[PDB]
Ligand binder design. Structure first.
Ligand SMILES: *[C@@H]1O[C@H](CO)[C@@H](O[C@@H]2O[C@H](CO)[C@@H](O[C@H]3O[C@H](CO)[C@@H](O)[C@H](O)[C@@H]3O)[C@H](O)[C@H]2NC(C)=O)[C@H](O)[C@H]1NC(C)=O
Lengths: 49, 48
């Protein structure tokens, strides 16, 4: 998801469905790479709960 | 607000975004008791 070789043009924006798996969002939040990580119906810590 | 269950706000939000949400419920609910208790004080004057 976050590491594909290429992304789509924003007119055709690709959508990948995520299901039947464990999510640990700390892996992304601890990643010093991301300029932006804003949450809009939850708080980014509470994702893990 | 996002949800009519308190703990489904509180598990999903931090100390500040929850203060913005929760006070909505504190308002609405308070106005629901402030209504109900008025309605009873007047009915009570009817039954009195
Ligand atoms: C894109 O894919 C990269 C490869 O999977 C990934 O980089 C890797 O990130 C992990 C941490 O999740 C690193 O793991 C090591 O971290 C420290 C390094 O000092 C070690 O002490 C640990 O024992 C552990 O082995 C990898 O070293 C790192 N590899 C590379 C080549 O960067 C990126 O995080 C991925 N990016 C995104 C956006 O998902």
């Amino acid at each position: 998801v976050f590491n594909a070789t290429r992304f789509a043009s924003v007119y055709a924006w690709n959508r990948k469905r995520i299901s039947n798996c464990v999510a640990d969002y700390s892996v992304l939040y601890n990643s010093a790479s991301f300029s932006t990580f804003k949450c809009y119906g939850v708080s980014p810590t509470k994702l893990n709960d | 607000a996002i949800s009519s269950v308190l703990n489904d706000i509180l598990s999903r939000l931090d100390k500040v975004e929850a203060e913005v949400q929760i006070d909505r419920l504190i308002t609405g609910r308070l106005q629901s008791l402030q209504t109900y208790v008025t309605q009873q004080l007047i009915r009570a004057a009817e039954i009195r």
